[model samples]
Target: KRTTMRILIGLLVQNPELATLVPPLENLDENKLPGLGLFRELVNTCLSQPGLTTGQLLEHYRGTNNAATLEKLSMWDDIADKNIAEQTFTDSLNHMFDSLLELRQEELIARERTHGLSNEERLELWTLNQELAKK
Candidate 1:
């Protein structure tokens, strides 16, 4: 289930400069999905500490329970047949980010049925439409 998580983690480990493409996330539940939570940790770590190297990122998991999984992720980078495309990384991240936008769209639309939209809400709806359709 966390294969997606593995792929993203592996990609970041190999090419951290792509870190800039990562989008902000809200409401990530580690208790429900540890993979997503680990991912949140990676993004936060990447943002919190710029110029993080592959080994540096891996160090965060060293000597911990997640160390095995971290090793596997790094291996994925080493075993790849060819280098991954930057667009591939961005597309995968964009897909995950798009899901968050979908949640907001549903939230705002449901609220609109019961109440009127404020100016900011209206603006958000327009922005959401563009964002939701772009990919």
Candidate 2:
């Protein structure tokens, strides 16, 4: 998961073209909607793959919720016995995009509570969120 997060941040924020495309001050969750909205169209291409198990797909999200995806990935050989080889890069990419969108949504929820953020903190959030717009 550390590696995944690094790659994702690199792809989304390090891309000069994408960084410029993302706007500032609007919520990260809202910003993610546009990118993932385009990503949604490709989801079907992955689900069409033969022999993939829903449980395996769900496992990724489960580990994410528990903040254990990296650990889970380390034990991937054992997990593979319970899953299939056919769930490929495309499927994983769709899942990654969806996960990022969900993360932004959750952060928005946290941001909504007035007690959790100061004015400067909110502004910092706004700045960090601008990175989402870049790529």
Candidate 3:
């Protein structure tokens, strides 16, 4: 549930291949996802410091507010215990992306009631719909 970001981070930290396997998230509405900034940071680090570990990621964020909370995050189980397969990784990532896209669509829908969408945004919304449909 709320652990999607946490679990995703945990998986990224535990696996090297995953960092290369996953795509970067873009146009995130931080208002919809409270931890988007931190997640973005983690993704950046994942890409930049190829093959980085969980401790390294945590250590990288030591000065940040979410650092300690993140340290406590992996306090549960080692992600390696499950031995995440690439297929499972991509499937879970698809669901995560879908959830975010749904919320993004909702945000657009809400905004439509306020004013209206620009031509490009309307087109973007349509593309989002198609993407959601394809999945």
Candidate 4:
């Protein structure tokens, strides 16, 4: 359970845009998906900050009232302190900004990936995984 929550948060942290795709929590039962409560909360957090990069989102969450988010912020702060002590903080932050730019490139590639597909075609493709899983 601990590992699962960690990985789930990691995914959300890595790709905040995923929140836009998750249906509301009322559609899912907690008994069937224990980690979903956290998932929903993280999704809401992402939705609240529409156009921010991961680094920016991290900063936003760090200043928020969520205990879980605050815990993660503490972890981040510890790592940042270590980096500052090592005199690598500036390079580390610049690297993060570069990575954010790369994330935008990835989103653009996804948008262009099926540029010619019709709406119906895209809908079918979108449901492909769920349909396959039910077979």
Tell me each candidate's RMSD, in Å, in order.
Answer: 4.3, 15.5, 3.7, 13.9
* TM-score of each candidate structure, all chains considered together: 0.64, 0.25, 0.64, 0.41
Candidate 3: tens digits of C-alpha lDDT, residues 1-135: 444766666666556457777665654544556876565666677788865676677777777887776776656474543365455566667777788889878878888778786778778899999988888
Question: Considering TM-score, where higher is better, how would the candidates rank from best to worst?
Answer: 1, 3, 4, 2
* CA error at residue 33 for candidate 3, angstroms: 2.7
* Error in Å for residue 14 of model 1: 2.6
Off by over 4 Å in 4: 1-3, 26-35, 63-135
Q: Where is model 1 more than 4 Å wrong at Cα?
A: 1-3, 20-36, 44-60, 77-85
Q: Which structure is stronger by lDDT: 1 or 4?
A: 1
Name the runs in model 3 displaced over 4 angstroms: 29-32, 54-70, 78-85
Give the Å error, residue 129, model 3: 2.4
Candidate 4 lDDT tens digits, 9-111: 4445555665664545443435435655665677687898888655666677665576566457435433343323223322432333344445544544576
Q: Residue 60 of model 4: what lDDT?
A: 75
lDDT of 1 by residue, 25-83 (tens): 54435543456777767767777878887778778666988778877877773435225
